[PDB]
Amino acid sequence: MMKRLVYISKISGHEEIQRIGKVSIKNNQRDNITGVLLYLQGLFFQILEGENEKVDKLYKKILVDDRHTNILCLKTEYDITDRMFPNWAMKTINLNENSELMIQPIKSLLQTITQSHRVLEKFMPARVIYLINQGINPLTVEPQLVEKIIFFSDILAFSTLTEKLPVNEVVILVNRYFSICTRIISAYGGEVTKFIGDCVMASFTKEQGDAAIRTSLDIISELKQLRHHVEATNPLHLLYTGIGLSYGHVIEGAMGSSLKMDHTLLGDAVNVAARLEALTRQLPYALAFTAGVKKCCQAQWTFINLGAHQEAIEVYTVNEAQKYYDTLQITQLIRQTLE
Amino acid sequence: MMKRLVYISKISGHEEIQRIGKVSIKNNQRDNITGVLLYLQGLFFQILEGENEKVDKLYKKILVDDRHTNILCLKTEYDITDRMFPNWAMKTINLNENSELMIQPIKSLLQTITQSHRVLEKFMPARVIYLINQGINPLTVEPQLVEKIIFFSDILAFSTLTEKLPVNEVVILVNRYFSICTRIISAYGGEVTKFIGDCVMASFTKEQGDAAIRTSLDIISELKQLRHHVEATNPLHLLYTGIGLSYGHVIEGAMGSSLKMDHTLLGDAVNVAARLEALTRQLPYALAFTAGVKKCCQAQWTFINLGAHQEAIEVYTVNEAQKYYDTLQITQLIRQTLE
Ligand SMILES: Cc1cc2nc3c(=O)[nH]c(=O)nc-3n(C[C@H](O)[C@H](O)[C@H](O)COP(=O)(O)O)c2cc1C
Numbered sequence: 001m002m003k004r005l006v007y008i009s010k011i012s013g014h015e016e017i018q019r020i021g022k023v024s025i026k027n028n029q030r031d032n033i034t035g036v037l038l039y040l041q042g043l044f045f046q047i048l049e050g051e052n053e054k055v056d057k058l059y060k061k062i063l064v065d066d067r068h069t070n071i072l073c074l075k076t077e078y079d080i081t082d083r084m085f086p087n088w089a090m091k092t093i094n095l096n097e098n099s100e101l102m103i104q105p106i107k108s109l110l111q112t113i114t115q116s117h118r119v120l121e122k123f124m125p126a127r128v129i130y131l132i133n134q135g136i137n138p139l140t141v142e143p144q145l146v147e148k149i150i151f152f153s154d155i156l157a158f159s160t161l162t163e164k165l166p167v168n169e170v171v172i173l174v175n176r177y178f179s180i181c182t183r184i185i186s187a188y189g190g191e192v193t194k195f196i197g198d199c200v201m202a203s204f205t206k207e208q209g210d211a212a213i214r215t216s217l218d219i220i221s222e223l224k225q226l227r228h229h230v231e232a233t234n235p236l237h238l239l240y241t242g243i244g245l246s247y248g249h250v251i252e253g254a255m256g257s258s259l260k261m262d263h264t265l266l267g268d269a270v271n272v273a274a275r276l277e278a279l280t281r282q283l284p285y286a287l288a289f290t291a292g293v294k295k296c297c298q299a300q301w302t303f304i305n306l307g308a309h310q311e312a313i314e315v316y317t318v319n320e321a322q323k324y325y326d327t328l329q330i331t332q333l334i335r336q337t338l339e
Numbered sequence: 340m341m342k343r344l345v346y347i348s349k350i351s352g353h354e355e356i357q358r359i360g361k362v363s364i365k366n367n368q369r370d371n372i373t374g375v376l377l378y379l380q381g382l383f384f385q386i387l388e389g390e391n392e393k394v395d396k397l398y399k400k401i402l403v404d405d406r407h408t409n410i411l412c413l414k415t416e417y418d419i420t421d422r423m424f425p426n427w428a429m430k431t432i433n434l435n436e437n438s439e440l441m442i443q444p445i446k447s448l449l450q451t452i453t454q455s456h457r458v459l460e461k462f463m464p465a466r467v468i469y470l471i472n473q474g475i476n477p478l479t480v481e482p483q484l485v486e487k488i489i490f491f492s493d494i495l496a497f498s499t500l501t502e503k504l505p506v507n508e509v510v511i512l513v514n515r516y517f518s519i520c521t522r523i524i525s526a527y528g529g530e531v532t533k534f535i536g537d538c539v540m541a542s543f544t545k546e547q548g549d550a551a552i553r554t555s556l557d558i559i560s561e562l563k564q565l566r567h568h569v570e571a572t573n574p575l576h577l578l579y580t581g582i583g584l585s586y587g588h589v590i591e592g593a594m595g596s597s598l599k600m601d602h603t604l605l606g607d608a609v610n611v612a613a614r615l616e617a618l619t620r621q622l623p624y625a626l627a628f629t630a631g632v633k634k635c636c637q638a639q640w641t642f643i644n645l646g647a648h649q650e651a652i653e654v655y656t657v658n659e660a661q662k663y664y665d666t667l668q669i670t671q672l673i674r675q676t677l678e
Pocket residue numbers: 009020023024025027028037044046058061062065067068090
């Protein structure tokens with residue numbers, strides 16, 4: 001039983017690589033692993049093949065290696081019938097250091113496609129990248145009914161802010177907001193589906209109840225630090241958020257046609273979380289979630305019941321989500337500052 | 340003044356390619372154009388370089404050529420200082436037909452990266468693909484304030500349908516719906532931003548007023564044909580839509596961080612179009628748009644003024660958008676059929 005994987009990576013910092021192939025040779029030679037490692041203008045390409053399990057450890061050892069970064073496994077071939085390089089413990093080819101005409105073609109293509117690839121990667125849904133990082137083709141996965149926590153957040157009084165900031169300040173502000181949201185959601189095990197306007201869409205599993213709530217609090221908290229970090233001429237000092245969470249059945253998977261695919265979550269919980277985010281504009285709290293979310297949590301939160309809003313939904317929060325301000329006073333305090 | 344471009348394509352049908360390189364040699368040799376064309380397992384890679392304008396025609400001639408399809412230009416280099424293949428009218432290399440060990444590595448990589456590339460392409464926003472298809476890096480474009488028509492459509496009584504169809508029928512239905520929407524929007528010059536649940540988001544320019552309205556009508560019409568095409572056991576016979584259009588300033592461009600980017604439209608018109616789509620559930624029409632959309636149209640539509648809904652917005656339709664049914668009678672006619 002043998003398997004084969006392939007990945008691409010980026011070097012972590014700046015002919016320093018002659019000796020690292022002069023480590024791979026020895027330890028692959030010991031587990032009957034073969035494979036190739038290419039190098040071209042800041043980028044790494046490796047193929048690894050051997051019996052399914054001792055292949056898997058070194059790849060974990062490679063994952064945590066200080067000198068490359070941004071690792072993504074493209075293909076996995078399970079129970080391969082025979083090897084692609086039966087004689088190569090680890091063949092190392094520095095494609096930068098070849099000056100023959102006949103190879104410059106393929107060398108330039110390989111460079112252009114993978115640089116393109118790396119840009120496209122940044123626009124993928126987290127979940128599609130994750131599937132590719134196992135050996136699963138996202139255009140062949142059947143979508144599945146699953147129980148998820150759905151997350152939405154967007155910028156408060158953002159219509160006021162688009163009306164009275166120049167375009168280039170708006171973009172600086174929205175990028176900052178997206179990068180803080182994405183960093184914290186990811187750190188806690190969740191996945192960003194997409195951005196919809198100033199809106200961040202994300203989801204967590206039913207086991208990540210407390211992490212979805214911690215995520216929400218850490219985002220609210222980081223905006224608070226940021227607001228007093230900057231000067232009053234910086235649009236960042238007027239940046240506030242509201243967050244809605246919900247929990248339910250959703251159908252998750254890749255959908256559409258061969259003109260266009262997207263990663264999509266179908267089911268009513270998606271709409272519910274969006275309306276709780278909207279609702280926070282009229283509550284003295286910045287986070288609102290359903291009862292189903294409350295029941296997914298193991299930590300000992302102080303829950304606060306906010307009655308039924310709309311068929312009805314019971315709405316809840318935690319008191320650490322309490323505001324130190326009044327929402328109307330700030331949405332018109334944003335208007336006054338902006339003149 | 341010379342320029343260079345590179346693209347990848349897919350063959351349109353199934354050693355039939357020896358003579359097509361035996362046409363390129365002669366006509367490139369006549370305009371002082373050089374370049375490379377590779378072939379590998381169903382895929383084409385070409386590089387073209389010459390003085391900026393007579394490069395551009397043959398590439399248009401290539402675009403309309405019967406035997407490859409799915410053409411995407413990755414890179415463009417304007418006013419290149421000197422050529423990459425100074426001596427090659429058109430070098431043709433069938434990478435399938437080489438059986439040397441030392442090249443199989445790079446050949447297998449090139450295959451894996453570009454096959455991966457082709458899947459990622461299907462998940463991109465139309466507008467990011469379009470930029471790449473010119474020579475513009477989407478991670479370097481500054482976003483721009485622009486006047487757009489915003490389009491939203493989603494499935495009527497979809498919550499009833501998710502509650503009472505099996506997951507695999509839901510997916511068949513949603514895929515059908517997305518592929519009809521995407522085909523018609525594209526045919527008419529618009530671009531799909533993303534899918535949000537059962538929702539299709541798209542936009543048109545201010546010059547495409549009548550095309551956004553024709554798009555909406557052609558989608559409604561195709562669902563009507565489809566409903567009487569199929570049997571009553573097919574979920575497709577219960578598939579209806581509502582469509583909202585709006586027009587306003589939006590900031591359009593690539594935003595986020597290096598963890599995640601998305602193609603995004605900021606501004607209040609986005610929210611407005613979503614609420615008009617929602618509003619159609621209570622109107623005897625399936626399409627609703629603002630006054631600003633009405634003013635973008637040159638054709639001689641019969642407009643119907645639907646009063647103000649919400650600051651107020653005047654709502655409009657055309658009478659070809661008139662329903663032959665009652666929306667509540669059908670949303671509960673969908674419930675009865677489904678038992
Ligand atoms: C791109 C890349 C590929 C690598 N491939 C291998 C490999 O195939 N086999 C291996 O043993 N180490 C490989 N390494 C490095 C290992 O992590 C190396 O064994 C480590 O630096 C030291 O091993 P040790 O600490 O267990 O003694 C690779 C590193 C990089 C950056």
